[PDB]
Amino acid sequence: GSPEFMSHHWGYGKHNGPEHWHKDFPIAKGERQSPVDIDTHTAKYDPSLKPLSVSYDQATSLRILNNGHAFNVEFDDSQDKAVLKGGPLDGTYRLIQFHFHWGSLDGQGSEHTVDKKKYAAELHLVHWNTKYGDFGKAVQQPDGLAVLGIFLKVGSAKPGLQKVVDVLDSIKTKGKSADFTNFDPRGLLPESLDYWTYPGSLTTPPLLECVTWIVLKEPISVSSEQVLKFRKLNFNGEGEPEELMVDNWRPAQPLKNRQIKASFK
Ligand SMILES: *C[n+]1nc(-c2ccc(F)c(F)c2)c[n+]2c1NCC2
Ligand code: NA
Ligand code: NA
Numbered sequence: 001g002s003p004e005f006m007s008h009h010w011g012y013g014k015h016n017g018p019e020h021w022h023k024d025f026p027i028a029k030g031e032r033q034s035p036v037d038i039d040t041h042t043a044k045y046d047p048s049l050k051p052l053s054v055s056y057d058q059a060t061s062l063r064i065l066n067n068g069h070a071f072n073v074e075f076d077d078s079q080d081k082a083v084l085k086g087g088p089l090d091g092t093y094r095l096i097q098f099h100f101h102w103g104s105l106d107g108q109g110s111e112h113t114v115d116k117k118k119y120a121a122e123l124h125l126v127h128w129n130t131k132y133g134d135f136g137k138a139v140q141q142p143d144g145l146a147v148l149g150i151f152l153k154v155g156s157a158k159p160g161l162q163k164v165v166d167v168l169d170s171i172k173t174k175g176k177s178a179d180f181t182n183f184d185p186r187g188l189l190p191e192s193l194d195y196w197t198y199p200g201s202l203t204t205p206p207l208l209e210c211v212t213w214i215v216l217k218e219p220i221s222v223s224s225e226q227v228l229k230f231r232k233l234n235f236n237g238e239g240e241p242e243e244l245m246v247d248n249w250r251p252a253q254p255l256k257n258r259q260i261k262a263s264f265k
């Protein structure tokens with residue numbers, strides 16, 4: 001039985017997707033929810049914003065996991081090996097994992113939008129503020145997390161993404177994981193670090209309002225072949241009815257009492 005017949009655990013189907021989440025996670029209707037549409041002409045340039053400092057040379061990737069909602073590439077976050085600081089931030093944030101959101105078709109998949117335009121996918125590099133000691137404590141704080149969001153447009157292949165693409169055959173179904181040591185996340189970045197920033201939330205339940213979002217202006221180009229292989233993953237576990245892992249994105253939420261800032265003019 002597919003989940004709709006079995007359990008109302010949250011997901012991305014018609015019967016458990018974003019329009020339902022508020023019933024079990026009422027903060028879904030909160031005051032600083034993500035994602036949002038980035039209206040490029042109304043985001044204000046803030047000359048007090050610093051360049052973003054991304055220090056990933058010493059990163060220790062560990063494992064890639066299909067968690068039934070996306071796949072996470074996990075990192076050792078027990079030391080300041082892979083850290084994000086500067087930009088809008090006043091602390092040091094350790095990389096814990098990255099994951100993507102993507103569509104069933106190239107014209108959808110991103111969570112943030114830019115002037116209402118959707119990208120084929122969006123990469124989230126999730127970091128937590130070291131003053132809180134652990135991720136679980138950080139998600140009890142309004143400055144607990146910093147997420148670096150990067151858009152994926154379809155065009156030329158992204159060579160630094162290919163190791164991710166190549167391993168997906170080995171984590172097809174929920175609960176499968178594979179070794180993913182020796183992976184360099186610097187290969188997922190665009191050239192420019194110019195960004196928009198605003199206060200928001202996790203985009204998956206529990207939707208906690210802990211995130212300083214840092215969304216890069218420059219998308220990365222990926223090939224259609226790269227993103228279409230993401231779409232061969234499964235939401236289900238092995239031996240359960242097959243549900244392709246596609247359209248695992250939350251749509252844009254109301255901006256409410258927030259103004260997006262830009263690091264660039
Ligand atoms: C696949 N599956 N389906 C069911 C299911 C039982 C009544 C699914 F009225 C349904 F719609 C009535 C039960 N389970 C499975 N797999 C494990 C148990
Ligand atoms: Na090292
Ligand atoms: Na700040």
Ligand SMILES: [Zn+2]
Pocket residue numbers: 099100101124203
């Ligand atoms: Zn995400």
